[PDB]
């Protein structure tokens with residue numbers, strides 16, 4: 033009674049038994065699948081805490097010992113006394129890592145064990161928040177040799193407002209509306225750019241202005257901080273055989289650092305816990321540069337290549353997009369900033385799938401998200417069947433603080 | 435009802451149609467399974483329930499709902515099933531149910547054409563020989579010297595007990611698959627077992643790597659018997675590239691007519707184990723899965739080498755460059771040869787239209803996202819950022835076990 037799953041390219045059969053532990057519930061019924069959707073008490077905080085503890089001890093192969101029982105009785109007594117609880121340092125490391133390990137839409141989870149967890153739970157103000165964040169970037173940017181890190185700020189607690197980062201990423205390019213209904217810069221950031229101005233930012237007028245940070249302390253308005261330019265590593269984009277490419281004046285940042293998700297560990301919730309890895313080239317090349325309501329440079333790049341843009345059948349879209357990905361990959365390599373290509377990443381993901389079958393008897397995977405957005409069937413994940421579901425700890429979306 | 439967004443526009447719709455879906459999927463609230471290839475695995479009260487279901491949608495379709503001959507049919511079937519344990523469809527009921535099955539095929543991106551489909555009635559077929567003539571006429575009407583035409587030919591229904599009419603082959607036209615001394619295959623590696631069975635039933639194998647198989651056609655209870663397709667019936671296209679002059683030297687080709695012949699057509703609880711249908715190719719089916727899939731013809735690295743690409747490292751995206759050009763050759767070769775084909779951009783753009791249509795006419799449209807998005811340039815097409823609901827309406831095309 034467990035999902036039989038097949039790799040069709042190879043002929044492999046696994047049974048996802050870990051799915052039987054699916055701590056939460058998704059949007060699919062037997063009458064209808066909604067898999068393509070983008071956005072799908074103390075007795076129970078304890079039940080949430082209890083299980084997480086039982087996991088943490090199962091990991092270090094110390095399950096059901098003296099210290100497992102001591103830790104259990106203590107938490108259930110700290111909730112009883114105060115209404116919440118505190119995780120030990122090593123329970124924070126394990127939790128943050130499990131939340132990476134559990135994230136169904138991440139193709140880069142081969143690396144989950146090697147994450148660097150900065151504990152910022154002693155943080156106190158907006159100005160100090162910024163300090164922790166700059167360290168994060170410095171450590172993670174590492175002069176282009178990217179290291180995966182997560183910083184955790186104080187947990188949500190009754191009686192005190194949340195620490196929150198208002199930017200969706202630590203590094204984002206501005207996006208100004210023009211009178212022609214055109215956006216100069218990144219059209220996805222038109223909103224966050226607004227907020228930045230109405231809180232006092234002097235706006236630039238370029239396609240790649242790096243936005244300031246908006247950092248909110250407990251029960252305090254968000255404060256506007258400027259990242260030091262020297263901290264933000266950027267890659268100018270150029271093609272190895274198309275020299276007219278670099279005169280598009282395109283560039284991207286080195287560090288993908290998502291700052292608007294909520295980490296959830298053993299019932300406790302950390303609304304502000306920015307994490308970062310390194311890029312897969314399709315994210316910059318296809319999503320960021322090609323999407324029609326992103327920078328939307330496909331037709332332009334095609335005209336320069338003298339492809340016949342008058343007809344679909346010429347495949348000018350597909351040709352131009354392959355070359356844009358090529359430029360991305362060549363630029364990052366030239367600048368010695370870590371990048372992985374969709375073939376390498378999906379190849380590593382298959383090994384991850386093998387590791388998790390042996391370790392946990394399975395692995396939550398969201399097929400529609402794991403398959404890269406170009407060249408789907410050329411990768412090995414395409415012909416692999418997957419079971420999507422939800423485990424804890426986890427990274428969650430949360431509503432914008434406005 | 436499911437609120438479903440087109441993130442490329444932001445448009446929102448509600449999928450009220452999904453509320454009529456009977457046959458349950460493999461998904462529960464605890465685990466999504468929409469990437470499984472065979473979701474739904476593989477007593478006169480139950481037959482009668484579905485039968486009445488199907489008679490009622492027919493009459494609503496033509497406006498004139500209820501009353502009329504509707505009462506007669508119901509009674510006819512009530513009388514029919516009580517008598518014999520089953521019933522027969524009127525020919526118009528069959529043409530209707532035919533199109534609906536197409537219109538409800540969640541994986542098919544070519545559904546805009548659902549209203550133009552040629553239904554051939556072949557329920558008076560009795561032998562394998564008669565089957566062969568019936569099929570030959572299909573291939574001929576369907577091929578039309580290259581200006582393809584949607585068509586389906588339906589054979590007698592599954593009578594209770596006893597053997598069925600059943601095309602053994604997956605498609606009416608396929609290329610043979612021959613093993614050898616290493617473990618490699620010559621021709622199409624997906625068709626080994628049907629080539630395995632044609633040989634051990636009286637076929638004669640071939641030299642090269644595009645040998646057109648015969649048909650193993652079956653009559654009730656009599657074992658299958660082979661039929662050799664007349665080689666002028668089978669229209670093929672040599673594949674050449676517009677600019678890459680050496681491409682044609684690779685000696686590649688694909689047949690014109692995709693004609694699936696191993697699925698089952700259920701209408702009003704009547705199951706037809708033989709019902710071959712055909713349309714025209716989407717270019718990526720030929721260029722991407724048939725030619726580039728690892729255990730298909732797998733020509734990717736040969737093409738990259740001739741293009742002088744660097745196969746040493748993944749980051750040269752050689753796999754991606756070669757693939758695009760193979761699709762360019764597919765398109766150009768079908769067009770020069772004046773055979774109908776559709777590129778994956780045209781098809782998906784028109785699938786969106788279909789979604790718009792189906793929203794007004796029935797308030798929804800079951801679509802399987804992982805099968806609607808083409809296997810290359812996925813995010814470049816308008817279906818990618820369009821959220822979809824998958825579910826199962828009737829009448830339908832369904833998979834069935836193989837006859838062996």
Ligand code: HEM
Pocket residue numbers: 131132135137138139140141143147180181182307308309310311312315372377401427
């Ligand atoms: C180190 C190399 C990494 C690579 C190559 C990578 C790659 C990716 C990709 C391609 C996606 C899907 C993006 C999309 O929506 O299209 C994704 C999503 C995600 N990743 Fe990873 N990632 C990496 C590191 C990390 C780290 C360090 C974490 C957490 C600590 C993480 C957690 C997540 C989460 C939670 C999502 C879900 C966001 C969503 O719903 O799209 N990843 N990643």
Ligand code: HEM
Pocket residue numbers: 536539541542543544545547551584585586711712713714715716719776781805831
């Ligand atoms: C006329 C142009 C047509 C085009 C371009 C087209 C295209 C496609 C494509 C690309 C698929 C997915 C193939 C795969 O990934 O396996 C598909 C699947 C399917 N189509 Fe269509 N189709 C057409 C006509 C038809 C017709 C005439 C019928 C039935 C009378 C039909 C019924 C189906 C069914 C039942 C599937 C199920 C998926 C499968 O079994 O592989 N289609 N079609």
Ligand SMILES: CN[C@H](C)Cc1cc(C#N)cc(OCc2ccc3c(C)cc(N)nc3c2)c1
Pocket residue numbers: 288289290292293307308309310311312315319429
């Ligand atoms: C489809 N793209 C649009 C912008 C939607 C999107 C939303 C969210 C969120 N929340 C997060 C998104 O990005 C996911 C993500 C998260 C973390 C990543 C890390 C750590 C590295 C990396 N290379 N990509 C990531 C990608 C995208």
Ligand SMILES: CN[C@H](C)Cc1cc(C#N)cc(OCc2ccc3c(C)cc(N)nc3c2)c1
Pocket residue numbers: 068069070219220323324325326400401402441442803818819820821
């Ligand atoms: C976040 N800010 C941006 C402006 C919002 C957005 C923009 C675009 C575009 N163009 C496309 C968007 O959709 C993302 C999306 C939608 C559906 C997807 C499906 C079904 C699968 C998949 N792998 N990625 C998707 C990604 C969102």
Ligand SMILES: CN[C@H](C)Cc1cc(C#N)cc(OCc2ccc3c(C)cc(N)nc3c2)c1
Pocket residue numbers: 471541544624692694711712713714715716719
């Ligand atoms: C999703 N079903 C799984 C992949 C089994 C399957 C295998 C093969 C092959 N080889 C071919 C298959 O059919 C694909 C198909 C079916 C019908 C088509 C029609 C009617 C038209 C068209 N242009 N392509 C089709 C392509 C299915």
Ligand SMILES: CN[C@H](C)Cc1cc(C#N)cc(OCc2ccc3c(C)cc(N)nc3c2)c1
Pocket residue numbers: 040041414415416417469470471623624625727728729730804805
């Ligand atoms: C077709 N007959 C052969 C013998 C079986 C097969 C072989 C190969 C290969 N190589 C690849 C195959 O892929 C099947 C498949 C599996 C998963 C798919 C998903 C998840 C989506 C999609 N659009 N097509 C799939 C198609 C099948």
Ligand SMILES: [Cl-]
Pocket residue numbers: 288315320
């Ligand atoms: Cl990004």
Ligand SMILES: [Cl-]
Pocket residue numbers: 692719724
């Ligand atoms: Cl095919």
Ligand SMILES: [Gd]
Pocket residue numbers: 273274275
């Ligand atoms: Gd050049």
Ligand SMILES: [Gd]
Pocket residue numbers: 742
């Ligand atoms: Gd040469």
Ligand SMILES: [Zn+2]
Pocket residue numbers: 319323813819
């Ligand atoms: Zn996109």
Ligand SMILES: [Zn+2]
Pocket residue numbers: 060064065066067461465466467468
């Ligand atoms: Zn589902």
Ligand SMILES: [Zn+2]
Pocket residue numbers: 409415722723727809
């Ligand atoms: Zn394939």
